[model samples]
Target: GSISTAVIDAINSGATLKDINAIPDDMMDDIYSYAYDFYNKGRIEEAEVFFRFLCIYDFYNVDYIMGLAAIYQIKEQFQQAADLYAVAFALGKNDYTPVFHTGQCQLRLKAPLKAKECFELVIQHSNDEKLKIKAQSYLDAI
Candidate 1:
């Protein structure tokens, strides 16, 4: 089967990357191409593999790291997502999006104090009123 079918099935069945590791290396390139196409189409889950593959080859790609963090957030793996975001931020990818999302994940994980800290950081670092307002709203709501 094509990587798309396998990947889509894995995602639908709640399988992680570990489950997909059994896929043959010969098909890895095809998988990569499929992932790349999906990424270009704005499918974050498909794009996630591109990022993960990039990370496997080069751990210094902060953007890929951010994408992986985002994937974890989408999966509701809050602490894992937060940890990755923290790493990305430390690597100087301290943009408001990651910060705001990290706050959201923290909130979902019931870590209100940590969520407040994340939101505060977003408010302090982001010049965008929309984002700042949203972060402030989340902070207030918590």
Candidate 2:
């Protein structure tokens, strides 16, 4: 089997390729920029291709997961967005931004109780004052 197969195996196992340097860090920066640019320009499908590729190749990266989740959210796929945001949160090492996004997705999915819990967590754990305020507003409405 080729290295591609190995990479796929690593992705399936939810691990990054520590032994194989599949993508150079500098090149990955360029690729991420392209993906983000495509997303910002409303070329969502194109962005998804790049983000999905990036995510599979770098499963530990929170930014890649967040980018993919943002696309799912924009496409109104709340379940996928919520799950992906959860993954991003796990990868973010105490970052709470993904939790805030998950709360939004839960709200969109009409899971008001779930969203309320997520927002409460954001208020309790997130250090971002602005984000906490926003989460507070959501909690107030719910």
Candidate 3:
């Protein structure tokens, strides 16, 4: 069989990724655990493979996107990491952690102004005291 353009076809059509490749929620959870285990081991390449699969299969899940973004961040792909983290932030209903991570990526990319903006956002909107403190530290540093 000629596997020419499955993903591209789906993208052009009205179908969503999950619509085409839906799996059981428990299956995705298992994959997330496996991916996180590899991440904990610092096996970035392996973790990335699993996270990418999970992200493609379940685009609505912030955890999967965050896993992939964190892998990219560790790999120093700052732009890619920041972009993915931005998506995760939206999917997570304005979660501050991804915003903080976006700031970290911006800092690494030598974009101080953008980094400061992100940190400020986290400090202003984050409900978690610990995360707000961390964002304040970054803001202070900036």
**Candidate 3 — what's its lDDT?**
0.82
Candidate 1 backbone collisions, by pair: none
Clashes of 2: 0
RMSD of 1: 9.5
Candidate 2 per-residue lDDT, tens place, 1-142, comes to 1224446776787545544786899999999999999989989999999988887677578888888888998899988889889988888758888999999999999999999999999988889999999999999888
The sequence of per-residue lDDT tens digits that candidate 1 reaches over residues 1-142 is: 1223435655687654445665455565565567667766879776886767755543444565676787778778888788777767766654677778878988888889989998998888788789999999997898
Error of 1 at 8 (Å): 30
The candidates, ranked best first by lDDT, are: 2, 3, 1
Candidate 2: Cα lDDT at 66: 88
Return the TM-score for each candidate structure: 0.66, 0.85, 0.85
Question: Model 3: per-residue lDDT, tens digit, 1-142?
Answer: 0012335545677676567656888888899999999989988889888987776666657888888888888889889899889888888876799999999999999999999999898888889889999988888888
* Model 1: lDDT to the true structure: 0.71
The 0-to-1 C-alpha lDDT of every candidate, in the order given, reads 0.71, 0.85, 0.82
Locate the minimum summed-lDDT window of 10 residues in model 2. 1-10
